[PDB]
Amino acid sequence: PNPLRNANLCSRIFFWWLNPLFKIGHKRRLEEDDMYSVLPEDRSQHLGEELQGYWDQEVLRAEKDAREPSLTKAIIKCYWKSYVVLGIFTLIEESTRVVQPIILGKIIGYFENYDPSDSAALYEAHGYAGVLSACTLVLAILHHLYFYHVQCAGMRLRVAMCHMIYRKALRLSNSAMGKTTTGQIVNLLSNDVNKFDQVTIFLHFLWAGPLQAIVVTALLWMEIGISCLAGMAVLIILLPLQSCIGKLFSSLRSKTAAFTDTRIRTMNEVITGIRIIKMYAWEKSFADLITNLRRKEISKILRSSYLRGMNLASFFVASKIIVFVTFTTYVFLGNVITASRVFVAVSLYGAVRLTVTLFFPSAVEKVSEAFVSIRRIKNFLLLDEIVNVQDFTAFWDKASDTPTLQSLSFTVRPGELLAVVGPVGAGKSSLLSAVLGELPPNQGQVSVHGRIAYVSQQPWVFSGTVRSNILFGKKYEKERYEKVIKACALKKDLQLLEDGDLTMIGDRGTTLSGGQKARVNLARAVYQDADIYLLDDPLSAVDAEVSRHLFELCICQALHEKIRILVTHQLQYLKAASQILILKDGQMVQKGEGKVGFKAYKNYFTAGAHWFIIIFLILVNLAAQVSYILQDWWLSYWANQQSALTEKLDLNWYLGIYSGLTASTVLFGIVRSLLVFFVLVSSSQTLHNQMFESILRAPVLFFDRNPIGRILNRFSKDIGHMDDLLPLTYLDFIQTFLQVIGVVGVAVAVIPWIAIPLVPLGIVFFVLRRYFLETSRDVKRLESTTRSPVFSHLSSSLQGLWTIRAYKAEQRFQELFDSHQDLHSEAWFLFLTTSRWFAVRLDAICAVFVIVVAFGSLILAKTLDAGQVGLALSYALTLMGMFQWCVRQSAEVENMMISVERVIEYTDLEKEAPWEYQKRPLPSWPHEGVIIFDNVNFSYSLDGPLVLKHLTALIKSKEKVGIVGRTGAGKSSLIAALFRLSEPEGKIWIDKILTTEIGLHDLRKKMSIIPQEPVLFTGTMRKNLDPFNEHSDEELWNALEEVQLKEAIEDLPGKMDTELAESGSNFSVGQRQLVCLARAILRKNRILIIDEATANVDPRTDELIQKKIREKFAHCTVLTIAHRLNTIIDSDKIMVLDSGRLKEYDEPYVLLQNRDSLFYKMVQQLGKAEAAALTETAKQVYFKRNYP
């Protein structure tokens, strides 16, 4: 529903149909459903289909030639017929813009020749004043039509482009999915396609600027003659100069984007891995790495911002220079300054200033930015894009030494389960992809019948309700739904959830546990009730008991009659499977906010520089605008002084002060524009370092009480604004605000009575502003909140591309994208239309001011000179567009300051205890590795429960101790206390030193940790092992041999200098664990803390790391958290935490022989044979340790 369909022409132009929503919004806060729908022209589907049609056409034409296709060509062939008629606005608007200076000139002419008693003269002047008023209204209306329509053009271009990007993304080949990663594609939408909103704004000025410059040259030629050409020479120097600056700025910005992208990726992994960075004490290395990336980036930003500031200063002072040279040569040729000529010419140059030195350079800049965007988009659009298997062989990459699947033949039929079994990387998932048909055969054939269900190994969940993620477009139905929810072992959680299965889910299921989203992902598949289930190991996404529970209930009971193809290692379940196919090396081996106060402004500007510099900044701004106003006032003063005069003015005095006034205007304009960027970029720099130091020393509790995305937004969005958009908007607002104050000041200074109409007029403005703002900030909230889901959907679909492609769900997912997109388009449509509603009426009251100035000058004409009125009116005419831009820019400024307020708070976080005390331990300390807990109590927060109480234990230099206990019993709490991840109560001694009497780095660097899950960081394999670069390469190779990885690195081209991926996918999980083990080996320390290190490792690798532990750390005291009690059963003693209480600490055999020990209960829970093995092992090692 949209009343713009029903609105009469007047209501279409002036948007009167928004008025009820203004009334509502003033009375109450606007919400998502207070929002009229977009017209059928703007609908995303209809609007993207056309551009794709023309892209197909141009691809075919280039295909018939040999050349590569052009995407700019498809865009033009599509949108030219609509966009070109918009130039009639531009044509009529710019033609009236050059006529209106002529009417102005005839008004000023009445004052130049004002006679005391001619009635007919007065009547004609009133006629021109009415014509001038009407010209102003028509200009305003055409301006607003044009800008409203080009903005809709840009919106539709973005919408169609985004539709195409999304359409292409769904069909990329898995090879294209390899060289392209989610972050790049999402940056397309989030960064590059947003450049199309700006493209269409100024393109009609690529011809109208030059054509209007030629027309203005002819008009000026009749006004003043040859002197016109000096100003036009300056104009044609500015054209190449400003266009070179714009292209060079675009180049610098294109390069700096790389540093920005690298910094944001490093910062993403820092914030994500901050706990391990803290335990390793590697904070110095990331401090350095981020410091250097940020230093490079801020140098690029400083240079880029100086270029942009020079372009802005060149616009601001363009007509000052153009007028200065024009009238300098005009007076050197013997002419005289008159108010009519001067201000007519000043007005014409004002028009040329806008179109040629603002809109034409702006167009070149934005087309350049658009071409880098279009190049990336074409590089994306051109990227590559019963059951029976026989003789199957295939390559992922023909450059491989071998095929990646080979010599494959098998068949499976209704009522069967086929297991795919074997080592990691044996091609099992690749096999499933082949059966799906994602991987075509290079030889052999695949044939399948019925619908296929593909369940990815990693779970996938998208927006909406958890039930929306499960149903996946299917009808909700009680019986099948209940059968699904019970078979997927999920009912309990959906009952415990207060909003049940209607709980809303985040961008990556961040509110869900891994097992929860896993069970969601499986439930989805089972709900589809397909014929063939390709089960790519759904079970490793849940705990071992739930894994067998899902195998029995979902796979055996629910999928009972189906074909199944289950990738798994749980061979113990496969007694119930029909057949197993074993792969190796790809070949078959076997077959069978919203408001901020003055304090935020002060803090922001003072974080940049010492307040003395800010006083100088204010003074430089005042001086810039004062010299501006004064140069124009000087022309008008010169015109009045000429008009008072044979003899002539002293060109030395007048032209000298003119030259000084104009030189200081240029000087302060330049320094003002540069110093704003320096101060505000130094502010962003200081605040980034303060926020980075705070986040580095902030306690872990800060990272529990914030999600990662929320903190990373401070570094991406908010600091992004503070580097790029905010300083530019500040300079824009400051420049426009001082212009407006100068207009009003000149007006009130020339006719003081204007102050009276200005009172009601000012009151109306302020009421209107308030009444608008109330709703304006609502829609800006609602724009942001409807923008975010779009990127979320893109990213989620990219992660789940296998599954949506498997379900043939591309159609519905394009509909979803279009729905999100057109919902955002309604918010963007209210942004556009509401911002026009306000701009129109601001220009309305501004036009009343123009009317008042004009007519009041005629009412008061006995009291004024021609140059006074010419000055006042020229300035008044300039108020149109300026004043509304000022007000809306002010709203932009205040909206961005919410980002500043969000980062300034993170400069004030609480901080952990100092890394080093004034007391420091001996360099030989720890000399023995003694650990003592004595009446220790520990809680993650002062307001939280005591998760550890009365913890009291000794750990000597030689013994090995296991840490055991139920989930949440406090095991991880012990690691947190020992590293002082939260400050413990009580006494902790290490080598007769209280851990609390030394710095955090003293003890953190002297304890080794093997995390629960390995993490690798982008950069060299040397960095991931020796980030401080103090070891010899001999030691690195010894360690890499010990961790059995040397062969892979030497096979890799760079050896240790090979560039690793941020997720380490270059290496297997076991290889990642081996990187961690290598780090621990290279750091010789007395005490090693092991965190569940092998609970999920395969036995044939677990025994390897067990042996490596027995060898490389035999001298160390070792504290081991372990689910896999076989990893710790040969400890000297074991600690059992009941619930924050050390209830057991004794020899494992002595414990287990007490059948009532909690440790014995925990082993018995495993099973009788497991407990028998564990007890026998403990008994024999206890005997042998008593024997020596």
Ligand X SMILES: C[C@]12CC[C@H](OS(=O)(=O)O)CC1=CC[C@@H]1[C@@H]2CC[C@]2(C)C(=O)CC[C@@H]12
Question: Could you give phi then psi for residue 1180, rounded to 5 degrees?
Answer: -70, -40
Residue span binding ligand X (CB under 6 A) among the ranges 3-11, 811-819, 879-887, 1037-1045 = 879-887
Q: Which residue's CB is nearer to ligand X, number 357 or number 1101? A: 357
Task: Identify the DSSP state of 440.
Answer: -
**Residue 842 CB, nearest approach to ligand X (Å):** 11
**Residue 143 CB, nearest approach to ligand X (Å):** 8
Query: What number of chain residues touch ligand X (CB under 6 A)?
Result: 8
Q: Which residue's CB is nearer to ligand X, number 312 or number 978? A: 312
Q: Are strands 948-955 and 1142-1146 parallel, antiparallel or unpaired?
A: unpaired
Side-chain-side CA neighbours of residue 906 (13 Å):
28
For position 147 contacting ligand X by CB under 6 A, the verdict is yes
Q: Which residue's CB is nearer to ligand X, number 100 or number 736? A: 736
**Residue 355 CB, nearest approach to ligand X (Å):** 10
* Binding residues among 561-600 for ligand X as defined by CB under 6 A: none
For position 164 contacting ligand X by CB under 6 A, the verdict is no
Q: Which residue's CB is nearer to ligand X, number 110 or number 146? A: 146
Q: Which residue's CB is nearer to ligand X, number 870 or number 881? A: 881
**Residue 228 CB, nearest approach to ligand X (Å):** 23
Query: CB–CB of 488/434 below 8 Å?
Result: no
Query: CB–CB of 530/1059 below 8 Å?
Result: no
Alpha-carbon gap, residue 1091 to 1110, rounded angstroms:
16
**Residue 885 CB, nearest approach to ligand X (Å):** 4
**Residue 739 CB, nearest approach to ligand X (Å):** 4
Q: Which residue's CB is nearer to ligand X, number 883 or number 1149? A: 883
Q: Which residue's CB is nearer to ligand X, number 696 or number 746? A: 746
Alpha-carbon gap, residue 850 to 860, rounded angstroms:
15
**Residue 308 CB, nearest approach to ligand X (Å):** 14
Out of 212, 250, 268, 735, point to the residue binding ligand X (CB under 6 A): 735
473: left (phi over 0), alpha (psi -120 to 50) or beta: left
Q: Where are the beta strands (DSSP E) in 28-171?
A: none
Neighbours of 590 (CB within 10 A): 11
Q: Which two tokens stand for residue 208?
A: 């109208």
Alpha-carbon gap, residue 1053 to 1059, rounded angstroms:
10
**Residue 119 CB, nearest approach to ligand X (Å):** 39
**Residue 877 CB, nearest approach to ligand X (Å):** 12
Q: Which residue's CB is nearer to ligand X, number 738 or number 1089? A: 738
Q: Which residue's CB is nearer to ligand X, number 143 or number 278? A: 143
**Residue 911 CB, nearest approach to ligand X (Å):** 44
Alpha-carbon gap, residue 415 to 413, rounded angstroms:
6
Beta-bridge mates of residue 937: 985
Q: Which residue's CB is nearer to ligand X, number 93 or number 912? A: 93
| Among candidate residues 714, 647, 722, 709, the one with its CA nearest the CA of residue 681 | 722
**Residue 316 CB, nearest approach to ligand X (Å):** 6
Q: Which residue's CB is nearer to ligand X, number 600 or number 844? A: 844
* Binding residues among 1015-1074 for ligand X as defined by CB under 6 A: none
Question: 3-class SS at 421?
Answer: strand
Alpha-carbon gap, residue 931 to 991, rounded angstroms:
7
Helices (H) and strands (E) in the chain, counts: 41, 19
For position 129 contacting ligand X by CB under 6 A, the verdict is no
Q: Which residue's CB is nearer to ligand X, number 739 or number 857? A: 739
DSSP 131-183: HHHHHHHHHHHHHHHHHHHHHHHHHHHHHHHHHHHHHHHTT--TTHHHHS-HH
Binding mask 690-729 for ligand X (x = CB under 6 A): ----------------------------------------
For position 739 contacting ligand X by CB under 6 A, the verdict is yes
Q: Are strands 931-938 and 960-965 parallel, antiparallel or unpaired?
A: unpaired
Residue span binding ligand X (CB under 6 A) among the ranges 733-741, 850-858, 1032-1040, 1076-1084 = 733-741
Out of 882, 900, 1142, 1162, point to the residue binding ligand X (CB under 6 A): 882
For position 776 contacting ligand X by CB under 6 A, the verdict is no
First-last CA distance in the chain: 89
Query: Please, is 560 exposed, middle or buried when counting C-beta atoms within 10 Å of its C-beta (0-12, 13-18, 19+)?
Result: exposed
Q: Which residue's CB is nearer to ligand X, number 311 or number 736? A: 736
For position 354 contacting ligand X by CB under 6 A, the verdict is yes
**Residue 889 CB, nearest approach to ligand X (Å):** 9
Contacts of 590 (CB under 8 A, 6+ apart): 580, 581, 582
Residue span binding ligand X (CB under 6 A) among the ranges 392-400, 415-423, 881-889, 1029-1037 = 881-889
Q: Which two tokens stand for residue 1099?
A: 């036995």
For position 881 contacting ligand X by CB under 6 A, the verdict is yes
**Residue 712 CB, nearest approach to ligand X (Å):** 31
Alpha-carbon gap, residue 507 to 535, rounded angstroms:
24
Residue span binding ligand X (CB under 6 A) among the ranges 486-494, 610-618, 878-886, 1052-1060 = 878-886
Going across the sheet that includes 948-955, the strands are 948-955, 931-938, 985-990, 993-994
Out of 198, 212, 250, 736, point to the residue binding ligand X (CB under 6 A): 736
Q: Summarize as ranges the residues that interact with ligand X (CB under 6 A).
A: 147, 354, 735-736, 739, 881-882, 885
